[PDB]
Amino acid sequence: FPRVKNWEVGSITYDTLSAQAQQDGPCTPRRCLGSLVFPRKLAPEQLLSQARDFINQYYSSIKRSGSQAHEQRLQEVEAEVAATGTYQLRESELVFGAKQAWRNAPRCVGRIQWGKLQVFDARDCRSAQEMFTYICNHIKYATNRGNLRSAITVFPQRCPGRGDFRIWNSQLVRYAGYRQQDGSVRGDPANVEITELCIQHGWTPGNGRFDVLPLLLQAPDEPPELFLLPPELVLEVPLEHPTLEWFAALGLRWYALPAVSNMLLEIGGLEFPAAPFSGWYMSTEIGTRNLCDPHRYNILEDVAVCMDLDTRTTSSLWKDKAAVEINVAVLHSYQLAKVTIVDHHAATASFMKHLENEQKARGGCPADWAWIVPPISGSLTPVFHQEMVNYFLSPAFRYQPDPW
Amino acid sequence: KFPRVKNWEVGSITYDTLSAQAQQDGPCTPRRCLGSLVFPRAPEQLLSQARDFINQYYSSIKRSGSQAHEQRLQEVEAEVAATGTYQLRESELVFGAKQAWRNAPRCVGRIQWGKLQVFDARDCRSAQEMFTYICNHIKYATNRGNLRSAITVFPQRCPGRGDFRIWNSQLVRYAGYRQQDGSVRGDPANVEITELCIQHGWTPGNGRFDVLPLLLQAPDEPPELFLLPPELVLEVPLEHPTLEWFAALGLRWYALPAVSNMLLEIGGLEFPAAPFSGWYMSTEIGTRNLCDPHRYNILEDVAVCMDLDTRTTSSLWKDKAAVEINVAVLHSYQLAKVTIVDHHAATASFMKHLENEQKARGGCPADWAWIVPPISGSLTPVFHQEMVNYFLSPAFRYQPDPW
Numbered sequence: 012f013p014r015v016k017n018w019e020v021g022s023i024t025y026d027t028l029s030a031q032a033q034q035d036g037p038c039t040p041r042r043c044l045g046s047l048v049f050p051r052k053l054a055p056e057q058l059l060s061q062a063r064d065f066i067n068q069y070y071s072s073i074k075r076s077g078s079q080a081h082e083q084r085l086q087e088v089e090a091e092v093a094a095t096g097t098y099q100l101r102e103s104e105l106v107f108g109a110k111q112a113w114r115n116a117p118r119c120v121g122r123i124q125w126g127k128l129q130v131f132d133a134r135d136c137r138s139a140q141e142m143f144t145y146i147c148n149h150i151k152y153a154t155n156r157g158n159l160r161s162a163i164t165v166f167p168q169r170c171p172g173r174g175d176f177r178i179w180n181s182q183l184v185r186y187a188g189y190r191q192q193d194g195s196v197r198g199d200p201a202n203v204e205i206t207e208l209c210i211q212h213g214w215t216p217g218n219g220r221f222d223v224l225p226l227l228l229q230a231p232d233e234p235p236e237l238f239l240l241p242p243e244l245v246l247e248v249p250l251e252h253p254t255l256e257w258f259a260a261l262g263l264r265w266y267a268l269p270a271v272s273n274m275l276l277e278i279g280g281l282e283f284p285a286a287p288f289s290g291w292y293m294s295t296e297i298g299t300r301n302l303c304d305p306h307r308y309n310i311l312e313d314v315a316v317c318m319d320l321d322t323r324t325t326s327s328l329w330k331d332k333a334a335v336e337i338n339v340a341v342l343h344s345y346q347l348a349k350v351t352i353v354d355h356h357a358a359t360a361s362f363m364k365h366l367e368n369e370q371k372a373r374g375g376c377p378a379d380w381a382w383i384v385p386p387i388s389g390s391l392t393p394v395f396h397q398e399m400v401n402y403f404l405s406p407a408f409r410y411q412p413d414p415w
Numbered sequence: 416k417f418p419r420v421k422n423w424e425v426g427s428i429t430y431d432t433l434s435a436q437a438q439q440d441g442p443c444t445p446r447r448c449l450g451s452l453v454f455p456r457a458p459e460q461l462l463s464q465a466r467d468f469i470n471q472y473y474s475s476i477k478r479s480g481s482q483a484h485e486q487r488l489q490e491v492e493a494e495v496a497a498t499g500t501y502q503l504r505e506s507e508l509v510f511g512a513k514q515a516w517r518n519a520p521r522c523v524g525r526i527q528w529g530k531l532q533v534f535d536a537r538d539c540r541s542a543q544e545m546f547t548y549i550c551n552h553i554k555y556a557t558n559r560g561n562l563r564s565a566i567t568v569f570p571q572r573c574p575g576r577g578d579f580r581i582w583n584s585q586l587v588r589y590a591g592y593r594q595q596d597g598s599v600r601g602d603p604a605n606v607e608i609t610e611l612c613i614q615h616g617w618t619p620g621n622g623r624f625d626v627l628p629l630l631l632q633a634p635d636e637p638p639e640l641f642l643l644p645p646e647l648v649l650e651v652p653l654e655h656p657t658l659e660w661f662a663a664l665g666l667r668w669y670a671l672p673a674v675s676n677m678l679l680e681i682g683g684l685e686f687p688a689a690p691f692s693g694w695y696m697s698t699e700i701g702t703r704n705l706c707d708p709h710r711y712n713i714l715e716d717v718a719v720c721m722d723l724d725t726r727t728t729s730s731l732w733k734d735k736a737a738v739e740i741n742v743a744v745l746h747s748y749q750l751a752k753v754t755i756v757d758h759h760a761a762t763a764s765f766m767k768h769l770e771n772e773q774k775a776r777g778g779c780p781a782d783w784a785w786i787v788p789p790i791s792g793s794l795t796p797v798f799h800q801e802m803v804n805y806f807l808s809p810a811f812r813y814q815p816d817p818w
């Protein structure tokens with residue numbers, strides 16, 4: 012029973028939920044690998060065990076298990092896998108699993124929100140054109156003219172027969188990355204691979220630094236098909252600074268809706284290789300990581316030149332001053348556009364509250380400190396001083412191999 | 416199956432084969448990672464540890480399998496058979512202290528590990544002689560502001576005698592006076608050691624920057640109270656290059672960070688008193704010691720003076736004030752001609768260390784959450800370096816407080 016201290020307050024907690032940890036993580040008594048981004052590498056009896064555990068949680072979570080629907084659902088499933096080799100979730104068990112998989116996501120700082128989630132059941136989907144319809148309705152619903160609402164759309168589960176639904180893009184909205192004569196990139200360097208695939212599947216390239224890529228949606232067995240997103244569907248925010256008037260002339264933009272489209276959803280031994288989810292941004296994701304990472308847009312020095320900072324020496328802290336101003340610009344620009352955004356201070360303070368609630372509810376909360384602490388001003392946020400236990404519970408979102 | 420380690424800024428992949436040699440167990444299991452915990456924590460064990468260390472020493476000077484190597488192993492075997500313990504040679508003691516520093520997974524200053532002045536105090540015999548050694552350490556290492564890394568090693572733990580201990584966690588600390596209300600004047604981190612100094616006969620002050628006396632414990636004897644000669648404690652008053660009111664806050668820090676309460680372990684021998692010092696990375700003073708809510712907690716005061724909008728988080732006043740406090744710290748130390756390194760230079764040199772160690776040893780134990788500085792994390796290159804945390808020996812270790 013790990014003991015966990017908050018060094019800002021002195022308070023002590025024990026994580027009894029960790030005792031119930033399932034699939035093994037990457038660490039051993041020999042060596043800790045908690046900093047690695049992708050740990051490890053990416054008889055229908057196992058199904059029944061996983062299926063049984065998920066039902067018990069469910070009927071506990073709706074307050075009373077035992078006999079009743081519990082014992083009947085139990086063998087409806089047991090008989091369905093005997094008949095089918097797989098089984099079907101009820102609409103409500105699907106809702107519960109999606110919400111739990113989010114609640115169990117250790118690297119998610121936004122989990123105070125885990126109860127408010129819109130689940131869109133897309134398991135009756137057959138065509139990639141239907142995939143595109145579900146996606147565009149999700150995008151419409153989630154964006155809500157800038158008043159962002161969490162949502163997930165669940166496409167058909169992986170069948171032992173043949174097919175898998177896949178969204179090839181890592182997110183629903185992504186800016187292209189064009190390689191040039193140099194070997195450098197115009198646009199987003201993280202997307203040079205997916206931009207190439209969209210090209211070689213028909214898409215006609217674009218001019219500049221913020222071209223929204225098309226969607227490459229893959230229905231079972233048939234290969235992926237290009238789809239362009241209607242531009243009035245992709246809400247974007249031009250970036251301006253409240254007091255540096257030249258900032259807007261840098262022509263920076265970002266999109267409103269962060270929507271992950273390439274992670275696998277796992278619920279009671281069932282696997283949904285296509286279950287896009289979306290929430291809203293914490294401002295340091297845009298301002299610090301996406302615009303300032305050396306291997307992303309890498310604009311920090313551009314901004315520092317414009318601010319007349321002394322870039323000749325590291326001890327002027329010009330990287331830090333410029334970064335704070337870029338984050339200011341992101342927060343200002345999103346507020347101006349009335350698009351939902353949260354700063355890292357408000358987000359981390361809410362995650363603290365979430366830890367407190369989860370301690371009473373389940374006796375702990377898997378949390379991955381390296382991902383919860385913001386990439387700027389870490390120790391100025393309260394999570395920096397919070398010890399955390401990281402472990403894997405089910406249902407869960409997981410990374411999967413890319414379909415190429 | 417050695418761990419595959421990626422640098423995401425460059426796209427680089429290495430494998431940490433060194434971790435396979437991890438000689439002591441950490442707090443993580445396959446069921447749960449506890450990497451974020453601050454304190455995770457006879458005859459034949461000693462000999463196997465001694466043999467590994469001797470083997471390391473003879474690799475370092477490229478004489479493995481040599482006669483001198485074979486002979487030193489037999490010599491150590493003989494001594495622990497007769498006495499239950501052995502003595503390090505001076506050359507081995509130097510190599511061991513350097514190796515413990517090289518192995519310290521949370522230390523971002525290890526590019527310097529080979530430049531370490533080792534003072535041998537293993538013939539020390541009283542608290543008074545302990546205090547003499549420490550003043551000579553502080554003197555040598557401070558060097559009028561041109562800081563030099565050093566360690567003084569006091570006698571090893573041995574059966575039938577108490578340890579030498581330094582009760583203070585650092586050789587220079589500011590007093591923290593607990594108030595009636597539950598507030599603190601001075602450093603809250605040092606309230607407990609401050610209360611122990613008073614009750615051992617020290618007249619307190621009332622300032623925010625009162626330098627504590629040393630409580631030195633010789634074997635089997637209550638700790639003794641020593642006051643450092645104020646001429647020995649180099650301090651730096653904090654000013655801001657362009658915020659002239661900053662100087663009026665009356666903020667100071669000391670030049671020399673000298674950790675005095677860890678245990679140094681070499682070849683199975685334990686040295687409970689082996690204070691070491693280098694120089695500060697400025698975020699430790701500016702961000703942690705000055706802006707932590709449980710430390711001096713000046714961030715809101717600085718922000719209000721800066722006329723920042725401290726009423727909403729979305730103005731980023733905390734981040735703007737912290738940056739300027741760090742600017743002041745770097746500026747004041749460069750002004751006072753006292754060695755200091757900023758977190759960009761420190762992490763860039765650490766990346767060079769990692770590349771050196773990959774070639775030399777095939778890996779390098781590194782605790783990510785401590786190597787990433789507490790502000791501007793992803794602006795530094797170590798943020799994007801995956802790391803493996805494991806325990807090698809020789810090592811510095813935390814040990815229970817003597818009281």
Ligand code: HEM
Pocket residue numbers: 109113116117118119120121122124128161162163288289290291292293296353358379382408
């Ligand atoms: C609504 C506001 C939300 C905020 C502010 C937020 C914030 C974040 C952030 C900053 C990360 C770090 C990932 C990275 O930067 O690479 C993350 C990870 C993640 N989020 Fe959230 N998120 C939100 C909603 C959601 C929702 C609605 C879901 C799913 C239904 C979700 C599931 C996840 C998952 C699966 C991860 C990766 C977890 C892991 O690898 O352990 N998040 N989130």
Ligand code: HEM
Pocket residue numbers: 512516519520521522523524525527531564565566691692693694695696699756761785811
């Ligand atoms: C010369 C410049 C040096 C710099 C810039 C430096 C920097 C640092 C920093 C910033 C930390 C984190 C401390 C904290 O916030 O808790 C640290 C930890 C540490 N340092 Fe260094 N240090 C230096 C020299 C040394 C020397 C000379 C030694 C020993 C001979 C040493 C051994 C350690 C140890 C044992 C730790 C704690 C490691 C652990 O718990 O794993 N350092 N260092």
Ligand SMILES: N=C(Nc1ccc2c(ccn2C2CCNCC2)c1)c1cccs1
Pocket residue numbers: 181269270271288289290291292293296
């Ligand atoms: N606020 C968000 N931010 C965010 C951004 C990128 C994310 C995640 C979770 C995985 N990703 C990528 C996937 C590829 N690996 C790097 C991270 C969350 C959200 C996205 C979706 C719902 S909320």
Ligand SMILES: N=C(Nc1ccc2c(ccn2C2CCNCC2)c1)c1cccs1
Pocket residue numbers: 524584672673674691692693694695696699
């Ligand atoms: N640059 C430094 N900074 C620093 C400050 C405090 C440190 C450490 C390592 C342990 N400590 C204390 C031990 C008690 N717990 C708080 C941390 C390093 C150095 C100190 C000595 C040589 S370099």
Ligand SMILES: C[C@H](O)[C@H](O)[C@H]1CNc2nc(N)[nH]c(=O)c2N1
Pocket residue numbers: 045046047048381382383423798799800801802
């Ligand atoms: C090597 C390191 O683990 C890696 O850069 C991680 C650290 N923390 C992170 N935290 C978030 N939120 N997103 C990330 O991509 C990363 N990357």
Ligand SMILES: C[C@H](O)[C@H](O)[C@H]1CNc2nc(N)[nH]c(=O)c2N1
Pocket residue numbers: 018395396397398399451452453784785786
């Ligand atoms: C809970 C958390 O591990 C704790 O506050 C740590 C985080 N990382 C740190 N890193 C360094 N270098 N120094 C510290 O004191 C801490 N504190």
Ligand SMILES: [Cl-]
Pocket residue numbers: 269296301
């Ligand atoms: Cl993103």
Ligand SMILES: [Cl-]
Pocket residue numbers: 672699704
């Ligand atoms: Cl310190």
Ligand SMILES: [Gd]
Pocket residue numbers: 319320321
């Ligand atoms: Gd200039």
Ligand SMILES: [Gd]
Pocket residue numbers: 657658659
């Ligand atoms: Gd001024």
Ligand SMILES: [Zn+2]
Pocket residue numbers: 038042043044045443447448449450
């Ligand atoms: Zn671990």
